[PDB]
Amino acid sequence: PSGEWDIVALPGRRNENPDDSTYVDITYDFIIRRKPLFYTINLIIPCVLITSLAILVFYLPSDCGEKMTLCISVLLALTVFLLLISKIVPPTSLDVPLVGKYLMFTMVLVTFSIVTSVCVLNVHHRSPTTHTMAPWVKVVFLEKLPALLFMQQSVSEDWKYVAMVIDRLFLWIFVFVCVFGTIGMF
Amino acid sequence: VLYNNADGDFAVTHLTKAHLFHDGRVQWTPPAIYKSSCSIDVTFFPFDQQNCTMKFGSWTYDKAKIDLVNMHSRVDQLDFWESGEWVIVDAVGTYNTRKYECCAEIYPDITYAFVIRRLPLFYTINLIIPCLLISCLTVLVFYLPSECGEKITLCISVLLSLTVFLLLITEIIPSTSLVIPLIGEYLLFTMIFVTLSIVITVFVLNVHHRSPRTHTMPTWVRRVFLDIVPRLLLMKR
Amino acid sequence: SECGEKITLCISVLLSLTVFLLLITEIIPSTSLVIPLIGEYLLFTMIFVTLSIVITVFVLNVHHRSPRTHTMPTWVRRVFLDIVPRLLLMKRFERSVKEDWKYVAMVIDRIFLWMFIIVCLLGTVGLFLPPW
Amino acid sequence: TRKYECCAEIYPDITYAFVIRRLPLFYTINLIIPCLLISCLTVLVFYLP
Amino acid sequence: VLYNNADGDFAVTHLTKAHLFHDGRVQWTPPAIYKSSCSIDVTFFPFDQQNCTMKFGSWTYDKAKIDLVNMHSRVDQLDFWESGEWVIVDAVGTYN
Amino acid sequence: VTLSIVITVFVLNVHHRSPRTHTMPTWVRRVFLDIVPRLLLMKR
Ligand SMILES: *[C@@H]1O[C@H](CO)[C@@H](O)[C@H](O)[C@H]1NC(C)=O
Ligand SMILES: *[C@@H]1O[C@H](CO)[C@@H](O)[C@H](O)[C@H]1NC(C)=O
Ligand SMILES: CN1CCC[C@H]1c1cccnc1
Ligand SMILES: CN1CCC[C@H]1c1cccnc1
């Protein structure tokens, strides 16, 4: 027994080219199956373990001031795993491994998360004395609020409420698209 | 020839001189460098034992023309070199006979089994004690106060450090899916707990900053989270 | 403590020392007969720096706690308000208790610093004298 | 045909030129797209308060 | 041959030519590349001293026929090349 | 990006300076309170 690799069957066939009338050979084929448990417990588990933070980031409140750290850390971990999984796979541009495609999609997702996070972080710290802009936002967000099944309710607190509403929205649509992304793996 | 070669010379390749006696006796002692392939069982890393086998035998002859006899039941070690890393527990020779599909006669062979152990001081002073040290911090983050606001930094640092240790040790051991190393399982277990710790701590941190004018809901929460504190043996205000 | 980056410095130091230790274990032989002196020194420093990080998270928790939750002023005001005259440090409603709490945090931090610096200086020089 | 400093006669030779191309999928999925992606953060810092 | 090899040539493989004199004297000087094994003691790193051993001798000849005699008590260094990483403190020969 | 980091440490120092250290308002209030309509931004 070989250990990690397992043999399945050993077909052996005589190849003869009738057109050359001179070419003879015997070709053996080896169909080998990799036992998945090792790479599963060493490459897939860390990936699925750290990939949840990508959508977890939004539930962090904006006032704490730490979204940037967590998001950049997730991005860096994903880049590390991507480079490693590219170094372990043979460099063939004929096809792409599925784990690599999943990593690339979730990396695009988290680099969209970082920009929407800086957006909410900027719209949070506005003061009620400089950027009022009431009429275009009051009615639209007071109408939008029930469309999310969120609790109901000095303008600084109002901007904080606005930021909370919009990043909750983004969390909803982000988890809704991540469910479909996980379904797309099957 | 040895049946268990991997990327090496099968038979003896130096062909040095030999000794004759007047009665027809002949003695020959060639030296060689052999490369065998033994199933390295890594479960109790680093407190490990290795059982590696070499298998010598004739190739074109049978018991009806050539017979092997082990002169010494054990391997001599009078010229052994202490590798500093490995010590030989024992080396046993065994005389066996088999029968292959090629032929009809039975063929003898000699199997040498080396049972050896690894001296553990090096890996316990350079590899496992740092990871076992930094794993003792995953419980520490919860005691840190909420308002300070650096808990997520500690959690991320611990998780990345555990990932680095795990991906480091994945090189030093074989990628054999028959069994799992113990240290690898322990580190993955600690990663599961640290990931869980970070999501529950971001949950509690969000619970911290939320303001009364937005998330009041005071009915159900006060009745339960103001009477467990006595059960938890902690003073009130 | 009020800046809020001490755990950042501790983690930076510890991870950098871990990286240097892992790095040197490439270059020196994987021999179990003896241990490299530099390896011993680095492991020693790692032990003390993780002890430092646990004591500093403790003092950080001591610092931020509120007068409305963890009052306990009977036993503490006796001892941690009399160590200061011995440690050669000059002395000075809810704000008063918060100031006292911050002060006791700073004092325990200083008194730990003295012991840690003495132990570090002793462990570095007191160990490096095989040749002389 | 060429001529070397050694000798008077001319010497024949055959030069084979292989013109080949690199399949880009591997590198364009592992190396250039991550850096091109993280380059979308150099300007983002200024918008942050 | 040397007894301390580790994945290398046991004997010289170039087999250069040798000088003969009318009296029957013969001299031979082949180059070689050897790979010996050292009991590396790393305690005073990096301020370290390394003590390496090589062990030459006949293979199938006993002392009853061939008797080795060292010419120089020290190893010659006339054609030494300064490596830049290691300096030879001393090299000593011993008959055993 | 290194130009960005130097300009951002500059602006971050500008933000936190106190009225009792770096007053200098005469020349600044004329240049940095009339540039706002130029950049299409609203005032208080
Ligand atoms: C080593 O393996 C051999 C062959 O499988 C076996 O016979 C022997 O029992 C093993 N040695 C020990 C100490 O178990
Ligand atoms: C080196 O080892 C040899 C052989 O044991 C020993 O005789 C010699 O003393 C050692 N050299 C030094 C400087 O100790
Ligand atoms: C004994 N050898 C080992 C495997 C094949 C077998 C064999 C039999 C006959 C001739 N050569 C080799
Ligand atoms: C005397 N030699 C030195 C070590 C091995 C031994 C030996 C034994 C048999 C044939 N040749 C050499």
DSSP A134-186: -HHHHHHHHHHGGGGT-----HHHHHHHHHHHHHHHHHHHHHHHHHHHHHTT-
Using a 10 angstrom Cβ sphere, with 0-12 exposed, 13-18 middle and 19 or more buried, the burial of residue B141 is buried
For chain E, list the strands marked E by DSSP: 18-20, 26-28
Q: Which of B152, B180, B214 sits opposite A41 (nearest CB)?
A: B180
Chain A interface disruption, residue of F15, F33, F44, most A CBs within 10 A: F44
Within 10 angstroms of residue B196's Cβ, the number of other Cβ atoms is: 12
**Sequence letter at residue B54:** M
Within 10 angstroms of residue B52's Cβ, the number of other Cβ atoms is: 16
Experimental method: cryo-EM
B–C: how many Cβ contacts below 8 A?
Answer: 80
Burial A100-111 (b: 16+ CB within 10 A, else e): bebbbebbebbb
Question: CA dihedral defined by C105, C110, C115, C119, rounded to 10 degrees?
Answer: 110
Contacts of residue B177 in chain A, CB cutoff 8 Å?
A: 3-4, 35-38
Could you tell me if C44 and C119 are in contact, meaning their C-beta atoms sit under 8 angstroms apart? no
Distance from Cα B51 to the centre of ligand 1, integer Å:
7
Tally of helices (H runs) and strands (E runs) in chain F: 2, 0
Contacts of residue F42 in chain A, CB cutoff 8 Å?
A: 131, 133
Q: Which of B17, B79, B82 sits opposite E59 (nearest CB)?
A: B17
Nearest atom of ligand 4 to the alpha carbon of E57: 3
What is the resolution in angstroms?
A: 3.9
CA Rg, chain F, in Å? 13
B105 phi/psi in degrees, rounded to 5: -75, 165
Q: Which residue of A has its CA nearest to D43?
A: A115
In this complex, the chains that touch C, judged by 3 or more CB pairs closer than 8 A, are: B, E
Could you tell me if B119 and B70 are in contact, meaning their C-beta atoms sit under 8 angstroms apart? no
CA distance D9 to D14: 17
CA distance A120 to A59: 12
CA distance C101 to A86: 53
Which tokens sit at E90? 């001393």
Q: Which of C4, C29, C61 sits opposite B150 (nearest CB)?
A: C4
Could you tell me if A107 and D34 are in contact, meaning their C-beta atoms sit under 8 angstroms apart? yes
* Secondary structure of residue B136 in the 3-state scheme: helix
CA distance E1 to E17: 19
CA distance B36 to B7: 9
Chains F and C touch (3+ CB pairs under 8 A): no
Q: Which residue of D has its CA nearest to F15?
A: D49
Q: What is the nearest CA distance from C131 to chain B, expressed in angstroms?
A: 24
CB under 8 Å to B52, separation ≥6 — which residues? B36, B38, B40, B113, B114, B116
* Secondary structure of residue D19 in the 3-state scheme: coil
* Secondary structure of residue D47 in the 3-state scheme: coil
